[PDB]
RNA sequence: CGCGACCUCAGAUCAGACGUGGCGACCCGCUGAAUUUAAGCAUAUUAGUCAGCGGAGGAAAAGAAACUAACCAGGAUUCCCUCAGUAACGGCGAGUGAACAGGGAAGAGCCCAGCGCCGAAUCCCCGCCGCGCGGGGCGUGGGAAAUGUGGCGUACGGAAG
RNA sequence: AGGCUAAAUACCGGCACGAGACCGAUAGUCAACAAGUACCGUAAGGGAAAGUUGAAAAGAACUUUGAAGAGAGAGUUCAA
RNA sequence: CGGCUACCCACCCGACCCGUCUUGAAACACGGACCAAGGAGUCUAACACGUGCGCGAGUCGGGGGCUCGCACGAAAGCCGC
RNA sequence: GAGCCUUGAAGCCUAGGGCGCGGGCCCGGGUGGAGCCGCCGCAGGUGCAGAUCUUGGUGGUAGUAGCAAAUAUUCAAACGAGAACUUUGAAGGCCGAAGUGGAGAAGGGUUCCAUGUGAACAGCAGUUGAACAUGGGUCAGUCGGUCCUGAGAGAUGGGCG
RNA sequence: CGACUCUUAGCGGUGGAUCACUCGGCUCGUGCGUCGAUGAAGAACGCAGCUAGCUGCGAGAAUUAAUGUGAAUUGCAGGACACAUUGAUCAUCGACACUUCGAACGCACUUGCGGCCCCGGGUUCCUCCCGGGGCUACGCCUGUCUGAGCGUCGCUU
């Protein structure tokens, strides 16, 4: 919506902050065994859902 | 026309974000919660899931209270100071 | 034989006790034993690697009679450093290769005051 | 001035004067996609905001 | 060696304070810094200053519950806070004296009939 | 259902008898518990003895078992008068007391 | 008309204190079906279970006979082996089904209302005084509760004078 | 027709421990891994797949072809 | 030089596609595109018969207790009024 | 079994030799890199060709059907290794004001903007994009919520349970 | 002669079966018996130099103080390197601190609207003026205060 309420907008901040790539300074991390993010949600593919 | 033609008419909401559980439960033409029932002093557990009390019981969360009362209580709750 | 009901012979609890102990129990469990003529001196067996003390190493790929000295001690790998065991990478540089403190013996050591009660507490504790 | 979402108009005021012993015309908050609040504090014409820049880190 | 906690027991609070007011403007001053690409040396010293400033805290916090402990001393009634913190199961608990204390007539019962020592063989 | 030739059974197993089985996998332990909890107490009252209150002789009830005669819980109000110790002390000397019992 | 005492009562953000909810493997109180079996199905069985609600503790309930037996009597309660798939219940069909002995684990017993005597010798609160580490109880004086009944002395095994 | 009480008894939840004629990654708890996670339905709710380089990264310097993906030599390792 | 075979080819003869329901299946009856992994008469209580063992008009300590705390001991040994 | 093994265990492959009627097994060779097996007894979650069997993988179909609702594209140049799909200019057209336009409410939540690469996504391609990576972007006394009640939902008093 | 098809072997590709390994389960037993109005379980948000998830934390936020141990963490620069000062990490953890919702407690929750007392700045003061601190839910127990009764009683107008 274009106006919604300061909870709401809140709780799409973390997904915003969420949606992010892996760095790439843990790949030569001792025992990481991780090689791409599998919580990366697409806007028109996943609805997250209010 | 029951189908897609009638899919596209949903464009309202009946389930929001909880107060108590925080989960889309929450309906907001009965004012209650779906999951515990917010209004309700008392959060409403079944027997007939036992999938629903894996999920909410104690121990799935943080317990930043209930994880220092464990270790508090092998030293029989102490209250002195370490000595020097 | 082990006889105490509260001590484990678990294969799987071992390993997992031994992979996740803490720093305070790594630097105990990378042990080096000490040379022959030190240990009829300071009435001991082994002792704890440091950074400063030096090394000798007795059994690998390079093994020999040349001393060497540790550079890092890296509790995470249980594995320690030496300057002078080291490797060529594929561009030409240098780059230390690791060794076990268990596959070396020590041969020097620093003598810092809490060193100096740590061994006096293991002599009189073997007497 | 990127500030706590806690902060309103007065406060902020009161921060800056506190802090950097300027005069504050107005302020106009707003809450950041991500999160945060930032927030426009526009100077008395007496100050210049080179020189309280200048002072402050950013140039 | 910057800040240690043993050293600033002994000021007095009047010093704490101003101790920790240059120590936010320095933090304030490092987080500006932060937002510049350069100074990438100064970008480790936020987290030591930020835990000197706990450290201040925790100085001051502790003499001030010190001071407020000696001061409810012996006396009835004393704040909450400062009452044990044990569980909620021991404070509605009965008080050793309450458990020791008992009946007169089990009191006269024992002293009368105490329980004697005693073996069976010849 | 029936066979040839063979006992008609009645077996109770028609109600849902799995959800409460009481598997006897414990009675080693019970049975060394038991033995540490009356090792203990033994040293606790060393100066007396094991199952310390004497118990009086009793005679069975029924006529099956009448012709035998065994242990008991304590001794008749009319036992300790013709013994001559009073009622209240005997607790404390060792000698187990049972008012109900008649003579 | 007013004043005062008692008695049923109202208000406070009065001073102090207490309960809410969560977990719920074990335990306690209530009501609680049907699928199934009966080769069909109503009584019955499933079952006084599942689901539902209310509570607490490391255990809870039980527990000192308005008991069991009918002979040479036993003696709180709890759990185990036997009694026993027995007595008995049942369209006496399917099926259901204990108890007393006895042997073991453990074995701890008591209080009060009442009847009577004691000048209420009783209890809570407040404040100064004499005490100990981490803070609460002993001796002093007034404000209440209580004679429509504090407390010692008493408990069916008798007790009191 | 009033009340208190530990004992032997039970414990698939909780905090720790020990053991196994059990399972060995389509098995064993749904979950050996960022698992009640991703994801699905408005909601009650449903619910996964997914272990193995090498002793040590020592993860292929450098030359050449190609814009790159990739490949030909070369190089580390006993072994690419 | 000798060699059957789990290699290929050819001729002669015989040769319908497997599993189960059925009196009758290759059927115009049903299932199967192929391959790898998983997959189905188990366990408890009771009964009847037969067999092996030990004792024997007796038999059975599975229920408890005893010796010493024990990795193997949640075993084993014993009760004898 | 003083059993075999980093001078090579298990496993896998094999126009090789050979045994047993058979279930199967032995040896040779090639991979493989750390355990395994014979004999005497014991206990099984113990033998697959099917169950419109469960899971995973792969074929014929087959480079086949299909990339056909709404009139339509063309020329030149530039950036680029690469041009029909990008950009600019020109020509020819459509939507023609109840639009293929300009704004909004619900809903989406960063999709908006700038820069950069071009393996994945766009059902062909791409220098392009709502994709990817980085960095920005939403400023209110007088825009709306906040105030008021409407149908309606709802605690205390009280009642029931 | 070629092409196509079929049957075998070698190599190669998809495929991830068997074998070996296991910081994981299942079962059995033992020890203890611990939540909260002094704010429980659970949920939301935020916190790291570079940080998306798990884990760990609460504006003192990838940990504070103290004790034990004794020279580090590690993917990368920096940084306390100092230890004849106080000394890194780790564990223990009895001392401080612990944002919002949540039995959730000022009313409702659309983060709005208040009401009292106190402390700093505004016309040096109340009068619907900013910041900060404390209190402001229900029922109930003991006591105090306030006050209603043509309920009963005594003296009095
Ligand atoms: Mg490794
Ligand atoms: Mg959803
Ligand atoms: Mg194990
Ligand atoms: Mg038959
Ligand atoms: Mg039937
Ligand atoms: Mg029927
Ligand atoms: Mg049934
Ligand atoms: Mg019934
Ligand atoms: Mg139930
Ligand atoms: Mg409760
Ligand atoms: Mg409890
Ligand atoms: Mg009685
Ligand atoms: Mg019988
Ligand atoms: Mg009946
Ligand atoms: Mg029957
Ligand atoms: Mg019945
Ligand atoms: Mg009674
Ligand atoms: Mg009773
Ligand atoms: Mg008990
Ligand atoms: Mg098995
Ligand atoms: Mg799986
Ligand atoms: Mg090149
Ligand atoms: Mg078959
Ligand atoms: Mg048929
Ligand atoms: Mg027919
Ligand atoms: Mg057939
Ligand atoms: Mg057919
Ligand atoms: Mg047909
Ligand atoms: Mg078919
Ligand atoms: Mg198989
Ligand atoms: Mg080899
Ligand atoms: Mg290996
Ligand atoms: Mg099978
Ligand atoms: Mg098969
Ligand atoms: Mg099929
Ligand atoms: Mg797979
Ligand atoms: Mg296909
Ligand atoms: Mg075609
Ligand atoms: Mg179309
Ligand atoms: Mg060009
Ligand atoms: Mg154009
Ligand atoms: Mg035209
Ligand atoms: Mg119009
Ligand atoms: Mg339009
Ligand atoms: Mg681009
Ligand atoms: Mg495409
Ligand atoms: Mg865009
Ligand atoms: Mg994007
Ligand atoms: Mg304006
Ligand atoms: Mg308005
Ligand atoms: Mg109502
Ligand atoms: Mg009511
Ligand atoms: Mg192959
Ligand atoms: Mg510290
Ligand atoms: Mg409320
Ligand atoms: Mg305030
Ligand atoms: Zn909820």
């Given at each position: ?5 300061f ?8 997904k ?8 790439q300074w ?17 806007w ?7 | ?11 309202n ?8 559980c ?6 907001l ?5 779906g999951?515990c ?43 002195g100071?370490?000595?020097? | ?29 990378m ?7 030190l240990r ?28 060497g ?5 890296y ?6 450093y ?20 268990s596959?070396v013996?020590?041969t020097?050591?620093?003598?810092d ?15 | 001035?990127?500030?706590?979402v806690?902060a ?13 012993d300027?005069?504050?015309a107005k ?11 930032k ?5 008395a014409?007496?100050?210049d ?11 | 060696?910057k ?17 920790l ?31 000197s400033?706990?450290r ?13 402990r ?8 004393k ?18 004296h ?12 024992e002293?009368?009939?105490?329980l004697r ?6 | 259902?029936?066979?040839?030739n ?20 414990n ?15 033994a ?34 109000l009319?036992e ?24």
């Amino acid at each position: 919506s274009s106006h919604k309420t300061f909870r709401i907008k809140r709780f799409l901040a973390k997904k915003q902050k969420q949606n992010r790539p892996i760095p790439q300074w843990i790949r030569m991390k001792t025992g990481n065994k991780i090689r791409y993010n599998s919580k990366r949600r697409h806007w028109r593919r996943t609805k997250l859902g209010l | 026309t029951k189908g897609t033609s009638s899919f596209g008419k949903r464009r309202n909401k009946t389930h929001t974000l909880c107060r108590r559980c925080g989960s889309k439960a929450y309906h907001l033409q009965k004012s209650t919660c779906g999951k515990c029932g917010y209004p309700a002093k008392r959060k409403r557990k079944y027997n007939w899931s036992a999938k629903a009390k894996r999920r909410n019981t104690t121990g799935t969360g943080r317990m930043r209270h209930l994880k220092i009362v464990y270790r508090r209580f092998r030293h029989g709750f102490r209250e002195g100071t370490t000595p020097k | 034989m082990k006889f105490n009901p509260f001590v484990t012979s678990d294969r799987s609890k071992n390993r997992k006790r031994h992979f996740n102990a803490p720093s305070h129990i790594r630097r105990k469990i990378m042990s080096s034993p000490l040379s022959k003529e030190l240990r009829q001196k300071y009435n001991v067996r082994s002792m704890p690697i440091r950074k400063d003390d030096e090394v000798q190493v007795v059994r690998g790929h390079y093994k020999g009679q040349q001393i060497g000295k540790v550079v890092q001690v890296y509790r995470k790998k249980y594995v320690i450093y030496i300057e002078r065991v080291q490797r060529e990478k594929a561009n030409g540089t240098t780059v230390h290769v690791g060794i076990h403190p268990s596959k070396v013996v020590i041969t020097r050591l620093k003598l810092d005051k809490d060193r100096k009660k740590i061994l006096e507490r293991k002599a009189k504790s073997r007497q | 001035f990127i500030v706590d979402v806690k902060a309103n108009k007065h406060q902020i005021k009161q921060a800056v004067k506190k802090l950097y012993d300027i005069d504050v015309a107005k302020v106009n908050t707003l809450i950041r996609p991500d999160g945060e609040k930032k927030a426009y504090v526009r100077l008395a014409p007496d100050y210049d905001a080179l020189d309280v820049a200048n002072k402050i880190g950013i140039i | 060696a910057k800040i240690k906690a043993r050293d600033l027991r002994g000021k007095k609070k009047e010093e704490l304070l101003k101790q920790l007011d240059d120590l936010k403007v320095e933090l304030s001053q490092l987080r500006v810094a932060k937002v510049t690409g350069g100074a990438a040396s100064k970008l480790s010293k936020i987290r030591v200053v930020r835990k000197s400033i706990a450290r201040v805290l925790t100085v001051i916090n502790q003499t001030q519950k010190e001071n407020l402990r000696k001061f409810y001393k012996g006396k009835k009634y004393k704040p909450l806070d400062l009452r044990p913190k044990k569980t909620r199961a021991m404070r509605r608990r009965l008080t050793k004296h309450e458990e020791k204390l008992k009946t007169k007539k089990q009191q006269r019962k024992e002293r009368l009939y105490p329980l004697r020592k005693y073996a069976v063989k010849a | 259902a029936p066979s040839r030739n063979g006992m008609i059974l009645k077996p109770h197993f028609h109600k849902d008898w799995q959800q409460r089985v009481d598997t006897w996998f414990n009675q080693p332990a019970r049975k060394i518990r038991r033995r540490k909890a009356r090792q203990a107490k033994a040293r606790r009252i060393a100066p007396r003895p094991a199952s310390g209150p004497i118990r009086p002789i009793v005679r069975c009830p029924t006529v099956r078992y009448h012709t035998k005669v065994r242990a008991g819980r304590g001794f008749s109000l009319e036992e300790l008068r013709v013994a001559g110790i009073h009622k209240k002390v005997a607790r404390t000397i060792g000698i187990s007391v049972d008012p109900r019992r008649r003579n």
